[PDB]
Amino acid sequence: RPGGDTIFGKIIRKEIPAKIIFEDDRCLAFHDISPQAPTHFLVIPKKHISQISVAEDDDESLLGHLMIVGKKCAADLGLNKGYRMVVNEGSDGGQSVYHVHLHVLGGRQMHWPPG
Amino acid sequence: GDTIFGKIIRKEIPAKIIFEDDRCLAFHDISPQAPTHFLVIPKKHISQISVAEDDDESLLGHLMIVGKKCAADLGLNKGYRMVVNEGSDGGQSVYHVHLHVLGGRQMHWPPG
Numbered sequence A: 001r002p003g004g005d006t007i008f009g010k011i012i013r014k015e016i017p018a019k020i021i022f023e024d025d026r027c028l029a030f031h032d033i034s035p036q037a038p039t040h041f042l043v044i045p046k047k048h049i050s051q052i053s054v055a056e057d058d059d060e061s062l063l064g065h066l067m068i069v070g071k072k073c074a075a076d077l078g079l080n081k082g083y084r085m086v087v088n089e090g091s092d093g094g095q096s097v098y099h100v101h102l103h104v105l106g107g108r109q110m111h112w113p114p115g
Numbered sequence B: 001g002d003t004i005f006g007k008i009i010r011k012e013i014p015a016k017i018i019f020e021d022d023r024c025l026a027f028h029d030i031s032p033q034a035p036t037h038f039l040v041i042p043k044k045h046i047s048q049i050s051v052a053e054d055d056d057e058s059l060l061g062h063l064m065i066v067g068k069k070c071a072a073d074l075g076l077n078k079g080y081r082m083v084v085n086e087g088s089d090g091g092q093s094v095y096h097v098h099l100h101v102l103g104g105r106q107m108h109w110p111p112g
């Protein structure tokens, strides 16, 4: 089972259902099960990386791809007033799934501070 | 159009610089929202993430890798939150793309 056995690894292998927005060879975008904004989705690599703090230098292109896919999906979903992208790292970040992911939230005014 | 982040990159006004290389700059936010709150910005003037090009992929990822390394150097061993704001709903404050890195306290949910 490539990609590991976190919930996200299982979603990648189609073993647990998800509402998928976009998929390519490097990543997957799907809606969050507990949305914090009218639109709230995740972009995740297919390669298993536990958290941003252990990403390798050679992961730069992949991490950037998450953002490019995030912004493209946001446009496809009509978030024309903007959105917020978030990575939660570790305990202080509130991380609950240890497979790297980018949140994209929009469809309402986001506030400051960002939590 | 030029922004205050352009002035910071050009060293025309001061900032507390954490790290610099040939393609990005990291510096403490002047209005910090956590005990540690810094920005990583590209030297290339991309106004907002929504207009970033495919060729910018590795540069954007570089911001994140630099951010993670700076976070470690600043002792954020308990974690942190990275944020990119887009447009008015995103609360984007400066039209030069920037990655926020916040830590040194519990970050809460929702993220704004």
Ligand SMILES: Nc1ccn([C@@H]2O[C@H](COP(=O)(O)O)[C@@H](O)[C@H]2O)c(=O)n1
Pocket (backbone or CB within 6 Å): A007, A031, A032, A033, A034, A035, A088, A094, A095, A096, A097, A098
């Ligand atoms: N089956 C699941 C389990 C979690 N999730 C979402 O994954 C996200 C994980 O983000 P954090 O690791 O930053 O908490 C949460 O927003 C959670 O609602 C999901 O969308 N589907």
Ligand SMILES: [Cl-]
Pocket (backbone or CB within 6 Å): B085, B091, B092, B093, B094
């Ligand atoms: Cl901002």
